[PDB]
Amino acid sequence: IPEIDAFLGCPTPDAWIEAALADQETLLIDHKNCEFKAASTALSLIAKYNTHLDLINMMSRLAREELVHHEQVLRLMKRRGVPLRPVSAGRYASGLRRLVRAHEPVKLVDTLVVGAFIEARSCERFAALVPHLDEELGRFYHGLLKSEARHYQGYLKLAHNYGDEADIARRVELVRAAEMELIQSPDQELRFHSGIP
């Protein structure tokens, strides 16, 4: 398990930061939804792998942590007068999930590797953002950054628990390249994990 910047294929582009700072409300609402989706994804993995007890125990606890984050973002939004509004999911997680192999057991390994990338990128991007944010939001985002690093390690360690070290290294190489492409490519919308607007 390498360090975050080493694991990831590129830093967050300055142009993404610029767009994010100009629309922190869209950022916050999509961030709130992402925390919820992390919990919902963790539950879908429990349902899909109902006999993988190690997975089930980790995902149940992970889902609860992400639901806390979801509620914390909602409280921050309420404090700052950010109303709720429909914000469709971005392309990011769907693009990464297209690289998952369609057959067990490597389907599960690839799914967990994609999860490690989503959490690692979230940690890197929080870190890129906080020097530009106000004190309250930077403090909040700094706390979340630490949990993302833990979740990145947790996802990658679960993948090794179920996968061959050699196939994981090649899976990481494939998703790392596609992840970098999703992060550096032009994008039509601002999302927490969007490309360059």
Next chain:
Amino acid sequence: IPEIDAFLGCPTPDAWIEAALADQETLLIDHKNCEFKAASTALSLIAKYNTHLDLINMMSRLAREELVHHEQVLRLMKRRGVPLRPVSAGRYASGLRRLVRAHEPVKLVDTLVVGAFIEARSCERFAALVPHLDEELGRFYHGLLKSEARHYQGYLKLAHNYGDEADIARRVELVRAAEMELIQSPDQELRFHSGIP
């Protein structure tokens, strides 16, 4: 907020308790699954009603409480050597969901009333089981009673928040009738919410 025996159309039949006691490992597995489905159903409502702030805040916290229950049952199965075996869902929750009207805003109100019945029945049924179980399981199930009553109250209170006292009384009367027949009808598989074997 009526009392639980008053809210429900029927007590847990004695024949169901005798079946449950003769097959406590299946009961525990289905119970674990029911705690997970409660949290998963909670997250589904957040997804469907993603700008209803009151619903989203209550269901996030509810989902976390039910995942704690999910993990507790898992730890109890470990202590008692219950294998993680796939156990199909019962007919109960899906039977109740067929009564949900197809158009908003009464669609949401009906869904919340169904949630109230499921939690009220779980409370009634835990209470019926407790005096017959061993000490460890009896105390565990007794500690869940207070949570289920609270969840029954929460669902019903949420239905009143989004709906007219007229159509809620109308909905409660219809679901009560369908729920008691699900509980009193013959059933071909022991589940926590199954009918009579």
